[PDB]
């Protein structure tokens, strides 16, 4: 059942923050970072300092190299995870 809550769990995160200007379905350095430091204050891992995040969100910048939407963050938690969490999940 986690697959159902975890799935929408991600969506809600972006659907809650992303969508302030009007177009929605996109997140800027302020929308993502703040959110991360907002939801992930004790368990970041994928986000260390403030400067790194900017590069982090940029490392996934696929849309227009401008900001990160739902597809950019979805690939993030997945890319960052699927890679290290793979065998690094232990350490």
């Amino acid at each position: 059942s986690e697959l159902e809550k975890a799935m929408v769990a991600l969506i809600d995160v972006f659907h809650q923050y992303s969508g302030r200007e009007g177009d929605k379905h996109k997140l800027k350095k302020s929308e993502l970072k703040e959110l991360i430091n907002n939801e992930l204050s004790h368990f970041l891992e994928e986000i260390k300092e403030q400067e790194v995040v900017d590069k982090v969100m940029e490392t996934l910048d696929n849309d227009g190299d401008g900001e990160c939407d739902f597809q950019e963050f979805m690939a993030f938690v997945a890319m960052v995870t699927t890679a290290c969490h793979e065998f690094f999940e232990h350490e």
Binding site: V52, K55, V56, E58, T59, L60, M79, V80, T82, A83, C84, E86, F87, F88
Partner: peptide, 12 residues
């Protein structure tokens, strides 16, 4: 992807 973290440039 294993130890490359797969991110891209940030961690490389």
């Amino acid at each position: 992807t294993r130890t490359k973290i797969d991110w891209n440039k940030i961690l490389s």
